[PDB]
Every structure is written in structure tokens, then in C-alpha cells.
């Protein structure tokens, strides 16, 4: 079929993505040798379909070929994976991925003129190396996403190579491609992390909630059928099985498209498009309009006297149906808010169905939902007002202080990333009509990044408790945490807190990132201080920086005018 053709056609690209994600230390020369092995396997299976290995799991084939490369498992420290076979080997390979890609060099940027020359002379080589470099730095991003990203990156290179000011074009036009990649990455890590911590049974409520919001005219049975396809799709994609991921993604899009009528109205130009665009499209299409005849409630869950019986006959399906009906009627709610509501409903019924008069007790379920949602909504409203008052940077500094207090054991680079990701929820969403849904959806992804994808991280006991107990209530849990008062920092050199003359300028993100790192390191150093004292000290340093840039020889200015943060005898290090 078309999917098998797409895979056969793109086998070189597919192989690079898989190899680079699994073995992020592997060199580009090493990639080329695996490419030749998989092309050959592809040709062999075409010559002889009934041969044994031609019906094996795709990952089992790829991992066999990687493990067969002389000295490679030992060179990149994955010999322990190759000493296992089949499922145990697949699991080991999955555990081998590293979220922290700081062991890699800075992304190798080509000279714009040579990049353009390379694009015209050797296009396959350029895209091959791009895809290698992207995949090893984004080990959990799903293949259809990465291939779409490569396509868009190619359109950027093609268009910008025709312009006079090539550098400005490349830098500008790359921004939304990067944002796409980072948005999908965050979302995929969130779902995969949840799958590993809690299993498919808790997690497929996520897909019921999202699909029911997006396709509110769908029938329950068809939704459940689609949810089964989606859950399988996440199983393979979360594993890292690139071939199975592509196949299962194509199945989901075909399932959706082959019932366009009786699912959706707003996906026609998507059901035209190519693999894998037709599906990155469907994912980006907006929510279909609710059936005009859909009221705000379903009295079948609060007004019927059959609730406890329906629940008892099949609790999983009963709660799936609740999630379907409630989600499709509340397009304004976030996914985490819907899952909190499902849990509250489940807890409510545990109590009510064992009381003297259950119908009199569960009749008031919507009052419980109303209170919990009002609390969430008020919190978002407060955070959005704070954003309006302080701007992006000002709010970010408050988050950096709070996050560093609560999770000081994280690297500064990580804390800085988490702070930027947190503030982006507010810059993207505040003031929109679905502000609540947008903010809570995007904010929740931060704690998904924090809690880990293929590891149960051990940060500190309070953070670990929030990561591992209760997906839907994870953000509220994090909001309740106090500073970790057991923390004692390592020494920090005085140079971490020294402003250098080269930093005086107008810049986008590297100068932003330097300021952000300063604040985080300061908070680690002075963790004992109150948030207000830290904010005050930081604004002192900020004021001094601003003046000294407007001074000529800015660095002598900084050292005479900056506040001191050392204990009396400290010159080289601060403790
Ligand atoms: C991370 O934590 C999760 C949840 O505790 C672990 O997943 C469980 O692992 C046990 C034993 O391997 C299985 O019997 C359970 O079925 C798993 N539960 C779920 C919900 O998936 C996971 O193994 C941990 N990661 C490790 C130990 O590396
Ligand atoms: C990787 O394996 C080598 C060879 O046994 C070992 O010396 C080294 O310590 C290992 N490195 C890591 C990071 O595990
Ligand atoms: C809660 O109920 C009140 C009164 O009916 C209503 O005004 C409000 O919109 C509801 N809030 C939520 C979050 O549903
Ligand atoms: Cl990733
Ligand atoms: Na590095």
C-alpha cells in the first residue's frame, strides 16, 4: 500500500532517525553503514516476502542490525542491550535514550552560503546530516513529526537560498519550524512519560478526552474504536519503533478519513494531503463545531437512577462514556481539568453508591465539578493578571525563583528550560477566548518534561511524590510544594556572577539565557533567603547591568557598582 511505499521510499531517512535516537553518541559515518544494511533487508524482503525475518517486528530487525556492527555496542556503551533479545532488548534500547543531550556539541550551523551551495550540489547529504543532528538531540520525538520538520526545514532552505540577505531569512523563517518541533516534542514526552508511569489504562482517558473535544459529533462506539488505534499508535511511537509508528499513525489517519462523514466537518484539505502531512494537518485542524442540539449537561450521570448499576456492570466503559459525554460538551476545559473531573466523579460514586440513598447523593455531582473548576479557573486568572502586570521576563523570574527553591537539585540549564517553557503557556494563551484551556494544557506539559520520559527520576522526595502520584492532579500538587530546606549547594565560582563586557547589547535568547542562568545560580547560592529578598537582589544586579552598559568599559563599572554576595573572606568561590 501507500504507507509501505512511503516507508520503502524513505528508508534512508527512517533508519537515520531510529539509529540516532537510540544511539545518540553514534557518528554520521556509523549511520551510513546501518542505512546500507536496511536497504539490503528491504530489497531481500521484496525478493522473498515469505522469508522469516520479513514478518518480524521492525524494531527487532533494526536492533539486530545495530547490535551486529563490530565493536559498536562496546564503543557506545549499549552492549548490555545486545546481550538481551527481543522484548528485553527492545526495553533496554528504550531505556538507553537520554533526555539530557548536553553531552552533544552545540548544533553544527553551516555557513549560509555553503549551506545553500550544499543544498544545490548535494541535497540528500544535507538533509541526511540535518535529520541525524536533529534526531540525536530529540530522541523521543515521533518519526512523522521529525519527517514533517525536515520537509519544512527544506522549504526554508530552498526559499532563503534565493534571497539577498540569506542569514536574516534563514534565522527568521526557521523560528516557526522550531516552535512546531518543540511543541510536538513536549506533548509526545508528556504522553509517553504518563504511559510509562501509569500504564495504558489510565492514559487512554487522555485520548478519549482529546478526541471527544475535537470530534464532538462522533458516536461512542466509533470513538472507542479510534481510541484503540490511537493507543496502539502511542505504544509503538513511545517505544521508538519508527516503522511501526509511521504505520500506526497512517492507520489512525485512514480510520479518521475513511469516516470523514460521521466524525468531522473540518478536515477535508487534510484528507487530500500526502503522508505524513495529511496527519500533522489533522492534528493541527481546529475543533469541529458541536452538534447544535448538544446541551451543557448529561443528566444520565446525575439524574438517572441507573448510575450505580451502569457503573457496576462495566466501570471502565461507564467512565469512558462519562469522559466522552462530558468532554464533548465542554470544549472550553483543559485536558487535565477534564481528567480531574473524571476522578472526582469516580470518587463521588464510590461514596454515594454505598449510602442509604445513592440517587440523592450523586444528584449533586455537578456542584463538585463546579467547585473544582472554579478553583482552577481562578488560579489561571491570577497567573494571567500577573503576566499582564509584569510582562514575560518579569513573570519568568518569579517562576525561576520558585522552581529553583522547590527543585534545586536540577541542573541550572534544566531549570532555565522549565522556566521558559512555563512562561510560554502565558505568552501564548493569556487573553484568548479559551485562555483557561490553553494555559492549563500548556502548563501541564512542563511537569511532564520534569518528571521524565523513560526514567522515574529521583529529584527530592516532595517533587518525586508529585511526579508519581496522580496524573490529573500533578500541577496542583507542584503548586503546593515548599522549598527543599535540606538542600546545600556546591561551591560556585565568582565568575558565574560576573557580568562581562561582551554581554552589553540587544539580543534575543542567548543573552536572555545568561540572565536566566544567573538568577537560578543565585537562588541556589542563597536558597536560605526569601523569594522577596532574592527578587530584590536580582533587581539590584539588573539595575547595575543596565547602567554599566551605558558607560564605556562596562565590566570595571559592574565590579565597582554590583552588590556583593560573598561572605567576608570569599574571593574565588561563593559557598
Ligand atoms: C517507573 O515506574 C513505573 C510505575 O511504578 C514502573 O512500571 C511498573 O513496573 C512494574 C515492574 O517492572 C510492572 O509490574 C508494572 O506493571 C509497571 N506499572 C505500570 C503502571 O506500568 C517502571 O518499571 C519504572 N521504571 C523503571 C523501574 O525503570
Ligand atoms: C561504558 O563502558 C565502558 C567499557 O566497559 C566503561 O569503561 C565506561 O565506564 C562506561 N561508561 C558509562 C557512562 O557507563
Ligand atoms: C459554576 O456555577 C455557577 C452558577 O451556576 C456559574 O455561574 C459558573 O459559570 C460555574 N462555573 C464553572 C467553572 O462551571
Ligand atoms: Cl525528544
Ligand atoms: Na555540550
Author numbering: 12 to 586
The authors write:
Afamin is a human plasma glycoprotein and a member of the albumin gene family that has been reported to be a multifunctional transporter of hydrophobic molecules such as vitamin E and a potential binding partner for Wnt signalling proteins. The structural similarity of afamin to hSA suggests that afamin might also be able to transport cargo in the bloodstream. The availability of four independent afamin structure models from two different crystal forms provides insight into the flexibility and dynamics of the molecule, which point towards a significant conformational adaptability when binding to hydrophobic molecules, metal chelates or proteins with hydrophobic acylation such as Wnt, supporting the potential function of afamin as a promiscuous transport molecule in human plasma.
Here, we describe how the controlled dehydration of afamin crystals was able to stabilize a new orthorhombic crystal form, increasing the resolution, inducing a change in symmetry and increasing the number of intermolecular contacts, and leading to a more complete model. The use of a humidity-control device has allowed the orthorhombic crystal form to be stabilized. The transformation involves a contraction in the a cell edge of over 10 Å and of the β angle by ∼3°. The number of crystal contacts between symmetry-related molecules of <4 Å increases from 1999 to 2752 and the buried surface area increases from 968 to 1128 Å2. The result is a significant stabilization of the molecule that can be seen in the B factors. The possibility of forcing PEG molecules into binding sites as surrogate probes by dehydration is intriguing. In the example of afamin, the presence of the secondary binding channel occupied by a PEG molecule opens up the speculation that afamin could, at least from a structural point of view, also accommodate moieties with two fatty-acid chains, such as phosphatidylcholines.
